[PDB]
Design a protein around this ligand. Structure first.
Ligand SMILES: *C(=O)c1ccc2ccccc2n1
Ligand SMILES: *C(=O)c1ccc2ccccc2n1
Lengths: 295, 295
């Protein structure tokens, strides 16, 4: 019982975090096999091809705990630098580089000077930002999920936008969203609420004994989506209905039955009550997140 | 910028988690130096002295990943069993066993069959329960804080109470609160809101640019505490005022100035607004937690 914002255990990623310094700029890097991945900002509308051609291997100081790693090659892939080192990281886990979709969640290992400081769970927003917690020095911190023994890296941190939300890249150095790795007037666009996740969280609440918002009514997918549009919720697809199957079967509450509760909650509010300790509808838990915690 | 429920990186604790089996009962244990600590329930109003005298070392199967550890001695300390093994854990961090106070926070590494599954942040409630997320098999999961390189273990998980909240012990096997490690009708008593933490979180909100709840008024400590009593908030002490000093100085908002905002929020509610993404007043962040994230 209970339901928490829960991150993956971070140890497999902690053993990969290093410090990268070029000039007077220091940030975090990710050491997997004999390559260190970090934001290309470490070499700073400049032309990064020009900036990198002017560097050599000895300009890069890579520190793994107390050991200095010798850089033997350098190259750029999109907004990430790849520094080849002379030593494979003996702590390299099984890993993949996997780009995530808006609405999916991941764990963030916030790091400063190559030293992990904290771990928390984030969702990729529909507008391709994350609501992270990052201070100066956090560039190069990574986001990930873990399946069995395999770390799927999905995010490297680059930027804070004017509203205080965050923007970054996949591990191929391609930005999530229409953002760049320099100071411009760029700003997050309008966001929307992740409907399938709200429904998953309502199922988590039922599994944990919160039932006050349930009702006898069912709705049609079409009539639900008309209400979703009015409150800035994403339309519900049949694929989303399908992915909620397991939770619907465990609770005995049909997906379109739960949709009628959500419609009522949007129209009427909570009337001073809470669900799973929240006074708002939470949209940062996926159906998989719920199944993992509410087994 | 940003403010998240943030746990400590769990790697130092992950390297200590083992599986302990006795009979048909399996749960988690904590392997530090040559001792494994686990809930004494693994040997199951019985007399545990009698139950343990009837065991021998060979009745305990301890598995660290794929390696079986040989048990060479066994003893009980309060509600924890201590199994001496023939091998010191080479991954033992610097550590301490430290009992925490109500109102303080810690990270929980939820574990099943000796395998870490997730990490989240918890506060010890005034009524000595935690609002955890634990399923069957989680007995022996631990809570901790980390300072520099040193893990301060403060919690070992034992019980789920009828309301779905959780009860456990320090690493000396002494329960937090008036609970026992067997099935009785025991229930959590009435809880209260941790006032100093709510104030710390309001400072976190100001640091992050949420200012709508501020006002020009100040109050007296006495008049504040009269309102706290009415809404089931703990009384504010001068020691708590003192610990909020650093946050008061960073924001330029006197503690008793912030108390006048909290009084207004309790009397009037939020009027459809949010603070740091919440529609309720959050009390599970200590002043230290805020300073760590809002540096
Ligand atoms: C960190 O990786 C990073 C990338 C880009 C950038 C631009 C401007 C200020 C700070 C930055 N940090
Ligand atoms: C786990 O450590 C534990 C302790 C005590 C207990 C009593 C009854 C049921 C389950 C239990 N688990």
């Amino acid at each position: 019982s209970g339901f928490r914002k829960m991150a993956f255990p971070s140890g497999k990623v902690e053993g990969c975090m290093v410090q990268v310094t070029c000039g007077t700029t220091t940030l975090n890097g990710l050491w997997l096999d004999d390559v260190v991945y970090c934001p290309r900002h470490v070499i700073c509308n400049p032309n990064y091809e020009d900036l990198l051609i002017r560097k050599s291997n000895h300009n890069f100081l890579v520190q793994a705990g107390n050991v200095q790693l010798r850089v033997i090659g350098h190259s750029m892939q999109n907004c990430v630098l790849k520094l080849k080192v002379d030593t494979a990281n003996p702590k390299t886990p099984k890993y993949k580089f996997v780009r995530i979709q808006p609405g999916q969640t991941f764990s963030v290992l916030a790091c400063y000077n190559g030293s992990p400081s904290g771990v928390y769970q984030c969702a990729m927003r529909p507008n391709f930002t994350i609501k992270g917690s990052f201070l100066n020095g956090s560039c190069g911190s990574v986001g990930f999920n873990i399946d069995y023994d395999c770390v799927s890296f999905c995010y490297m941190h680059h930027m804070e936008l004017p509203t205080g939300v965050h923007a970054g890249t996949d591990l191929e150095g391609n930005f999530y969203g229409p953002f760049v790795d320099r100071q411009t007037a760029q700003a997050a666009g309008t966001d929307t609420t992740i409907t399938v996740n709200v429904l998953a969280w309502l199922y988590a609440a039922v599994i944990n004994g919160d039932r006050w918002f349930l009702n006898r009514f069912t709705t049609t997918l079409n009539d639900f989506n008309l209400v979703a549009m009015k409150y800035n919720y994403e339309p519900l697809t049949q694929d989303h209905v399908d992915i909620l199957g397991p939770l619907s079967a465990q609770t005995g509450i049909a997906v379109l039955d739960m949709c009628a509760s959500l419609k009522e909650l949007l129209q009427n509010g909570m009337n001073g009550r809470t669900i799973l300790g929240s006074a708002l509808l939470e949209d940062e838990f996926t159906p998989f997140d719920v199944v993992r915690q509410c087994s």
